[PDB]
């Protein structure tokens, strides 16, 4: 939880409404990962639960502030997936709803935070519907999501939506250069891969993700001249498989853009690999492979417990098969 500077404006708006007693009882914040929406929600919760707020800032001395800092405030509720699991169950929602029927111990507001509404199951969302419709007095709900289009329509149609956008590329690049120390092309490529989110690029730099990307680039450079794509399996089989599939998809899309003579490319640090991909592959095969990669990534991210290695191996075998002459490429359907 880090307070990024670019979150200052939006906050000044939202809190203002809560100062006038005109705030919605259910706020849905749309933001890409790494945008810091969690920090904004935490700041709003701290302001709401403070007993003696000093303008737009929590005092930090009252009992509410002390309990929030200690993380033991009786009136503060959080719904997050259990350790290890990647979903939020119905039991937690039922427990929170049952608890909400009673008055606040400290005689103040009650705050319920959902870490990620996208993880809610259908039953959990349906259970939360009625409670969100007519919550008790002095009850505030905060929700966060990346794509609000996936949430249940009934759930969407009863919350105030607030959209956050990243700053201009120049500002993000300057901030990253201040934080991280890399080449300008590397920073720009990381930012573009992150869909313009400064936070995600910092996360990629901090860790072994960049090394994995370099290994994947080397493996693809070796594979493209020949017909041996199966060797990419070692570079792909890993917990962070969706990210590597996304990187491969961006590389293929950049190759297609170069084929069409475009100017801007997502990857601005490996021109040779993009040129080789464009030279050695036709546009139709590139489109088919991109579609297959996207579909496999979606299947991996959606299905629960699906076997990663088998799916990746099948994808690589099909990709190798397509490159052969006289193969009927797939067509999108609806």
């Amino acid at each position: 939880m880090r307070w990024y500077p670019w979150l200052r404006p939006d906050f000044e708006k939202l809190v203002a409404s809560y100062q006038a007693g005109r705030g919605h009882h259910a706020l849905l914040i749309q933001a890409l990962p790494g945008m810091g929406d969690d920090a904004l929600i935490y700041a709003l919760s701290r302001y709401l639960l403070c007993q003696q707020p000093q303008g737009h800032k929590s005092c930090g001395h009252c009992r509410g502030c002390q309990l929030m800092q200690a993380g033991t405030h009786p009136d503060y509720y959080t719904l997050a997936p259990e350790k290890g699991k990647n979903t939020l169950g119905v039991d937690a929602v039922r427990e929170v709803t049952e608890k909400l029927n009673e008055h606040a111990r400290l005689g103040g507001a009650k705050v319920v935070w959902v870490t990620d509404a996208a993880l809610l199951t259908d039953a959990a969302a349906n259970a939360l519907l009625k409670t969100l419709e007519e919550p008790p007095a002095e009850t505030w709900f905060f929700l966060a999501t990346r794509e609000p289009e996936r949430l249940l329509a009934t759930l969407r149609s009863r919350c105030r939506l607030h959209y956050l956008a990243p700053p201009p590329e120049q500002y993000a690049v300057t901030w990253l250069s201040r934080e991280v120390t890399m080449s300008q092309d590397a920073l720009l490529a990381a930012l573009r891969l992150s869909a313009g989110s400064p936070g995600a690029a910092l996360a990629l730099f901090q860790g072994d993700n960049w090394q994995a990307r370099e290994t994947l680039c080397q493996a693809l450079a070796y594979s493209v001249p020949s017909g041996d794509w199966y060797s990419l399996l070692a570079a792909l089989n890993h917990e962070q498989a969706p990210a590597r599939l996304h990187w491969l998809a961006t590389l293929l899309m950049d190759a297609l853009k170069r084929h069409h003579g475009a100017a801007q490319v997502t990857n601005v640090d490996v021109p040779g690999l993009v040129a080789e991909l464009a030279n050695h592959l036709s546009p139709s095969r590139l489109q088919a492979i991109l579609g297959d990669v996207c579909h496999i990534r979606e299947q991996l991210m959606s299905v629960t417990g699906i076997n990663r290695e088998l799916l990746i191996t099948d994808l690589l075998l099909r990709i190798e098969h397509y490159l052969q002459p006289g193969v009927v490429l797939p067509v999108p359907h609806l």
Binding site: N101, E102, H103, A104, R105, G107, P136
Partner: peptide, 22 residues
């Protein structure tokens, strides 16, 4: 009984609870 709670003191014990308010 306050706005949101009820406290009963008997002998050397004090028991405090909250109210449904429905």
């Amino acid at each position: 009984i306050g706005s949101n709670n009820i406290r009963a003191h008997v002998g050397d014990f004090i028991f405090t609870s909250k109210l449904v308010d429905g």
